[PDB]
Amino acid sequence: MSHHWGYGKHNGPEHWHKDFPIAKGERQSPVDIDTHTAKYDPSLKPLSVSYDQATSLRILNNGHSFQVTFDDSQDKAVLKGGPLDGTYRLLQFHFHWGSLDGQGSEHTVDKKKYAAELHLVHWNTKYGDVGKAVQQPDGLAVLGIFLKVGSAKPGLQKVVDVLDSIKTEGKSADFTNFDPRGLLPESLDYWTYPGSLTTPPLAECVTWIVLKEPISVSSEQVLKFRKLNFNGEGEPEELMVDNWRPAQPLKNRQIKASFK
Ligand SMILES: NS(=O)(=O)O[C@@H]1CCN(S(=O)(=O)[C@@H]2O[C@@H](CO)[C@@H](O)[C@H](O)[C@@H]2O)C1
Numbered sequence: 001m002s003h004h005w006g007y008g009k010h011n012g013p014e015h016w017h018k019d020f021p022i023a024k025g026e027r028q029s030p031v032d033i034d035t036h037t038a039k040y041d042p043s044l045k046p047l048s049v050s051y052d053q054a055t056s057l058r059i060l061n062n063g064h065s066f067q068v069t070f071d072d073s074q075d076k077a078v079l080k081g082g083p084l085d086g087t088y089r090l091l092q093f094h095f096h097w098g099s100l101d102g103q104g105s106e107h108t109v110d111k112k113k114y115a116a117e118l119h120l121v122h123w124n125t126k127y128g129d130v131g132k133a134v135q136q137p138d139g140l141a142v143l144g145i146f147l148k149v150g151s152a153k154p155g156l157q158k159v160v161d162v163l164d165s166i167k168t169e170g171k172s173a174d175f176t177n178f179d180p181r182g183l184l185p186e187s188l189d190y191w192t193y194p195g196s197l198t199t200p201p202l203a204e205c206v207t208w209i210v211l212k213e214p215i216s217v218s219s220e221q222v223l224k225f226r227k228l229n230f231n232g233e234g235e236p237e238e239l240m241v242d243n244w245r246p247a248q249p250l251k252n253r254q255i256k257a258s259f260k
C-alpha cells in the first residue's frame, strides 16, 4: 500500500485497512443486497429529490474516478425524505465501473454485479459543511444508481463527450448547466442501510439509498469511461477501470426496502 491508495494488486481494497483501520469496521460499504432478506418498511417515506435549481461547476479526474461538482453553498439541489431526517445538499456525483460489462458496481443485488454505479453524494446541512458532516454517523446520504449496458442514456451524453478533456489525474474542465435529473431512473423505489464511504477515509457517516431500478447506458458510453487514466500526464498509462470496492460484511445491519 505505497501509498496514494488505489485499486491495483499492491494498493487495492485489501490493503486499505493499513492506513484506514476502519476498513474492518462495523458499518462498511458497499454490501450485497440480499433481496429476500431485505425487509419492506411501510414506515419509510417517499424519497424527495429536488434538483431543479442544481448548479454544476466543474468536472474533474481525481485519480480514482471522475466527478461533477456542484455549488452547495445554498439549498439548490437537495435530498430529503425517505430514511432521512432533515435536508441533504448535493455536493458531487461520480461513478465506479469495470473493465468488462459484468463487473463495475460496488453494491451487488443477490450477488449480481452491474457494469457501473453512479453515486450522488449529499451532506446533512445541520452540520454546516461536508468536512464536519463526514465526522457524524448521519452526516452524508449517498444516492446509488446501477448502470447496465443496453440503450444509450441521453442525459449522460454531455458527460461522456467531455471526458477526453480530463483524461489524466488532476485535469478538470468547466461543466456548467448540467442537469443531474437526466441520470435518474423512472422509479425511486430503494433499499437503505447505514454504511460508509467506499473509498478512503472509509468514514462511517453514510446513509445509503440504493435505487432498485438501473439506468441503461450504451456500450459506447461506458467505453468512454474506460478510456480515462488513473495516471497523471506523462506517466505510464494505466486505464481507469475496475475502480470499485467489493462487498463488505453486513455484520449487525438490516437493509430496509421502500417497496413491497
Ligand atoms: N463512494 S462514495 O462513498 O459515494 O463517495 C466517496 C467519497 C468521494 N468519492 S470520490 O470523490 O470518488 C473519492 O473521494 C476522495 C476521498 O474521500 C478521493 O481521495 C478520491 O480521489 C476519490 O476519487 C468517493
Ligand SMILES: [Zn+2]
Pocket (backbone or CB within 6 Å): 094, 095, 096, 119, 198
Ligand atoms: Zn462512490
